[PDB]
Amino acid sequence: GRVADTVGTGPTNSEAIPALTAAETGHTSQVVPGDTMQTRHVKNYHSRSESTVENFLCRSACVYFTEYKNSGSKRYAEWVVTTRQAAQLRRKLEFFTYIRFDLELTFVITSTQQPSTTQNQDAQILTHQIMYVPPGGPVPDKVDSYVWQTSTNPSVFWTEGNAPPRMSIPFLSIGNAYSNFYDGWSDFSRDGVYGINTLNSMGTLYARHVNTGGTGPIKSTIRIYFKPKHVKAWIPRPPRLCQYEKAKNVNFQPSGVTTTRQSITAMTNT
Amino acid sequence: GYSDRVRSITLGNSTITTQECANVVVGYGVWPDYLKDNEATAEDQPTQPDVATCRFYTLDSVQWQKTSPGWWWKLPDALSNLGLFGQNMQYHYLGRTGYTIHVQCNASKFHQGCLLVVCVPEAEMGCATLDNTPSSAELLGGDAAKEFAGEPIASGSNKLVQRVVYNAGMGIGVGNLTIFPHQWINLRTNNSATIVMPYTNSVPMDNMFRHNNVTLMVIPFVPLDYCPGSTTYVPITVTIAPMNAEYNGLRLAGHQ
Amino acid sequence: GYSDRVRSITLGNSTITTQECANVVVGYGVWPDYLKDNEATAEDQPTQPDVATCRFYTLDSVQWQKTSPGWWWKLPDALSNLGLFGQNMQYHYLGRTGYTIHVQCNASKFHQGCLLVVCVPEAEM
Amino acid sequence: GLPTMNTPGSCQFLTSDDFQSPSAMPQYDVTPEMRIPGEVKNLMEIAEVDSVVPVQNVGEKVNSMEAYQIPVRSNEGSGTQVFGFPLQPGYSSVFSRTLLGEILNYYTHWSGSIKLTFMFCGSAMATGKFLLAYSPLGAGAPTKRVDAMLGTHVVWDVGLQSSCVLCIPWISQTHYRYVASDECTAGGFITCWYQTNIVVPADAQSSCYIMCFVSACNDFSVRLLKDTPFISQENFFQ
Amino acid sequence: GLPTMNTPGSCQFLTSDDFQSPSAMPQYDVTPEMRIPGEVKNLMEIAEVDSVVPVQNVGEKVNSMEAYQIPVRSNEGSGTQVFGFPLQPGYSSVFSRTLLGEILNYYTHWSGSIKLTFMFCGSAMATGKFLLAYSPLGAGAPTKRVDAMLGTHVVWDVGLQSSCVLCIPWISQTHYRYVASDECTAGGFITCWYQTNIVVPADAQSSCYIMCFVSACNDFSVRLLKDTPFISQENFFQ
Amino acid sequence: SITTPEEMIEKAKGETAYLPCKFTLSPEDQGPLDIEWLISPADNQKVDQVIILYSGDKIYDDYYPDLKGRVHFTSNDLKSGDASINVTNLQLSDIGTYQCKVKKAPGVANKKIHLVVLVKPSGA
Amino acid sequence: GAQVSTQKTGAHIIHYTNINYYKDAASNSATRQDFAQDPGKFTEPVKDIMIKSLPALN
Amino acid sequence: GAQVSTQKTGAHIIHYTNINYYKDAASNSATRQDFAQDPGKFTEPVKDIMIKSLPALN
């Protein structure tokens, strides 16, 4: 894991020309300082461990959050699982064309009492259900549906005040890797929406209150955190320059290649 | 004697020569080859045509003008109407191939200019209209080159490609395109570029009409210039040979 | 057990079965094979497509009427518009092939009739 | 006390957890096991058993035995179509209620080859020949016999051996396909055509029926358990 | 029960934690791995690849290809300046959007040597010689060629080999420097000067362009992961 | 989602506009299908008014007195992925923005069509 | 079945213990100590080796 | 008295530890790694073996 040492070199007068090459060939020069100047010998101990692909990707990030109430219209939350709605993790993943990983999911669930006129509020403690529906499974259309029975769908039940709930998911693709980019169509006539496949289909998450607590209104928020683990990745790419616009495509607004300075010899930015 | 500037490349009944070349770039160090038993999923016996399809096809030429932004070609599709490679694309569900790409542009010792030649895996492009995605006719040149633009494509309610060259149609910085396999054609050094590209995909085989998995791009970074009295018409010419081609799933012809 | 009336023939992605057959006639005792080095004259490397073209093609059916005189088919030409065999015919100066021919006609134990099935080299008419 | 630290996940109830737990009935002595015939170790053992396909699932025919019957007859021509349906073993209404289909609807992914057995059920005096064909996707379903013939197929000659097997091999760009309907993982088409006619003597019926059966090959498997869309409930039963 | 005692930290969720956890999908069988070209093990493998520098990033030139072009021409003198910028590989707008720069902006500390490759892109009939110079900090940037010559430098002679490499060696009082702008860890200056003129025959263009490339040497490394200032968001995308 | 969610269509008075709304389902989308078409007229300040609905296996017309009998679905089989509509006998007072809303939980998609009707039949 | 491995330390060795508790590999902790590198597929992807002290083109 | 066993992993091995804590077998964790199969009692329950390449009835 260590970085390379510096070989000490003395003066030189010869036909060897390490510093002259031809960039046309597609080759990157392997020159070191000793090729073009006198250097001392250095015993370098610095390490490259913090820039492995795993260490670069393996931190928790919030990919999405939403809300649901204990009364009224929106009694449960519903989210198609994806990495493309939050900028910071999407950008890190799109350094690579193809990638395999497992996931650690952590949920941060919090609640807030809402303004009301109801007197004598003595709410009991709230439990929450989170259900994961794989693609193709039937989905709940109301907070009191037989679907929440979860005979075969994994569900986590969690009571407020305890540690946040967490579970692992294996690499889940029908392909040999997830594809971050797809230059093509799903329909053989190419008259459809471009860039859409189902190699990244992961399913849907539903969240509800199991009990209502008390007589007052209460709104909860669920934040979903993805941490990739056991990562393998292929075919590095230029990082995303333009700001993201849509979750389902790469559409952008054009922008300059960097920011400006005053003149070609100016030593500061503008 | 010997010189490392000369090169000959023979495939099938075709051969290409060059007297001012740089080197040959090989993919990601990987030479193309047929799919092996322990990575296959499709069970039928594949056809391997082997000289009828693994040979050089020369596309239509293109003019380098002093203001040209650049060109691109999606690779399976560029050859899709062309010979028995095209016929085998039309009759099979599944296909697998690598490529030898060769880009040619000569000019005198008095002309100057510099082109980047890159082979981009999975070049998913953006639409000018942020809600839409671009139509097939905008993305697929089909044996004719597609052109980049010099200024941003105006937004409407259209299906045009956002074509501006300095974002490479992809929302990135164009100077960072050297992470991909590539060469430079620099008119004072070099009149040819050659890239050998292996098969790349997240699956072992794929449909060749539905998905274009690599894209050749040719982009002038230093514009063409010359002085009056010099020849003004300087074309660029692309020749492409599929390598180790295989096909699975024979049925009636078509793509729908 | 076993019966010499049943037969299966598989080629490429196709297979044919039959339960009332006679035997199989092989040419003039000679099974088909690729051309060898010491009999070749064309110097270029040949293409051998091998399942894309070596497989069963079924032609349009024909009605046997009580007064039918008979039918004929010239062989390269009968398949000339048909699949990748047709495409390879269209793109090449030269070709070489053998054939497996299979003619089918069923009827009840109460019908009667008799057909000759022949393969004629060089049928100049 | 041994110094410890609770991690996230502490005190959750995850329905697919696998933990030990104290028994409510200490030292209870279970009834000894008996040797019962037909022990099942794996659901695929069920999937590999043939079951009858409801091919003629048209209108009111699903409320009778006619859904399982495929009509054939003596024609005044040849090469017309007998049936066609898509290779969607969990999602096509042709396949969804077979043994194979009912097992598939508890899973998200499927892979492997499939067998279709046909049994001719006319009289012994009837003869005929049929073309059974599978056409991989990308070009649509064939509409004539001369287009169906280009794909993978069997020519079935009806005789003393009454049944014929069409094997639908796994030909896919992916290692797995979805159980739900999905165009990126389209399966292709299955069709059947008259190769010659049905021919009978006088005093035998000129109309006849074929029956179709489906099962899985020894290369078949399923992934990612889920709830079936077939069973449902509005209240607890009584 | 084994007697235990919970320590501080119990039941917290720390985003860079590394703990085991129960899988929601017991015994699921992952798709087998494929040999795909271009596997990446370490982000430094990307940093060591050359990419094109936007040196002429002045005004509207950042909205065209001219940002990557360095003008040179035949002069009526010698020794004038061609370009100059500071060694701030993560923070200078010259460097911030290169491959090297984009990786650096995810880190807090950087160390090691850097390579600048220049490619002359005039006609074959043009000749010239250039001085490429690095001046360590402490005295400001050089303003004449005779002051730039005192520091570390290369004299590039243009010919059949079209490209020349200036190595910027690690010369620092600290083992590491900050990615952000900071005077205690100032990096120094990079400048380029006409050593002789550009000389052409008649009927060849007297104006020409150079291009610059940056990459990391085999002694280079980065420390302390952080969030990049380049990507941002006001709502969840749709 | 719907194929081309933003577009504009120009026709002449007396002709009959085709408003395409073609959609594709994801494997996650397993709820019941709902299809709504609403309108925001250019001349008028009324906004977001249903003109034709499809739900629970059947169609519902008769929501906009103005388009009475002149708004229909074009497909014999709507749930296969076609929610396009025909408007007939076009006149200036209907120039506006039509909206197609397709629902099948979890999935939801919409499409905006800006219909311009011109006096003379001419694309200039 | 415990595994002992080395911790990350400074330069101028100390060990830690692990035991897997669950039945699937996807339940294990991250793989943070894989320090192999191979940049020669991205740098230097040329058919003919290029010796640094020689001219690139001759 | 710990038992070490193999985890479920992918193809192109890693182990886990268990110790029973309770006095009844019904307290143990599930039996998820029993991969034996025997379909020949449901397929092919015939008295006379049927060789696949021969006619079924003769």
From Swiss-Prot, chain F:
GO terms for biological process: actin cytoskeleton organization; AV node cell to bundle of His cell communication; AV node cell-bundle of His cell adhesion involved in cell communication; cardiac muscle cell development; cell-cell junction organization; defense response to virus; epithelial structure maintenance; gamma-delta T cell activation. Expressed in pancreas, brain, heart, small intestine, testis, prostate and at a lower level in liver and lung. Isoform 5 is ubiquitously expressed. Isoform 3 is expressed in heart, lung and pancreas. In skeletal muscle, isoform 1 is found at the neuromuscular junction and isoform 2 is found in blood vessels. In cardiac muscle, isoform 1 and isoform 2 are found at intercalated disks. In heart expressed in subendothelial layers of the vessel wall but not in the luminal endothelial surface. Expression is elevated in hearts with dilated cardiomyopathy. Monomer. May form homodimer. Interacts with LNX, MAGI1, DLG4, PRKCABP, TJP1 and CTNNB1. Interacts with MPDZ; recruits MPDZ to intercellular contact sites. Interacts with JAML (homodimeric form). Secreted isoform 3, isoform 4 and isoform 5 can interact with the extracellular domain of the receptor. (Microbial infection) Interacts with adenovirus subgroups A, C, D, E and F fiber proteins as well as coxsackievirus B1, B2, B3, B4, B5 and B6 capsid proteins. Glycans are attached at N86. GO terms for cellular component: acrosomal vesicle; adherens junction; apicolateral plasma membrane; basolateral plasma membrane; bicellular tight junction; cell body; cell junction; cell-cell junction. This is Coxsackievirus and adenovirus receptor. Component of the epithelial apical junction complex that may function as a homophilic cell adhesion molecule and is essential for tight junction integrity. Also involved in transepithelial migration of leukocytes through adhesive interactions with JAML a transmembrane protein of the plasma membrane of leukocytes. The interaction between both receptors also mediates the activation of gamma-delta T-cells, a subpopulation of T-cells residing in epithelia and involved in tissue homeostasis and repair. Keywords: Cell adhesion, Cell junction, Cell membrane, Disulfide bond, Glycoprotein, Host cell receptor for virus entry, Host-virus interaction, Immunoglobulin domain, Lipoprotein, Membrane, Palmitate, Phosphoprotein, Receptor, Repeat, Secreted, Signal, Tight junction, Transmembrane, Transmembrane helix. The Ig-like C2-type 1 domain mediates homodimerization and interaction with JAML. The PDZ-binding motif mediates interaction with MPDZ and MAGI1. GO terms for molecular function: beta-catenin binding; cell adhesion molecule binding; cell adhesive protein binding involved in AV node cell-bundle of His cell communication; connexin binding; identical protein binding; integrin binding; PDZ domain binding; signaling receptor binding. N-glycosylated. Disulfide bonds join C21-C100.
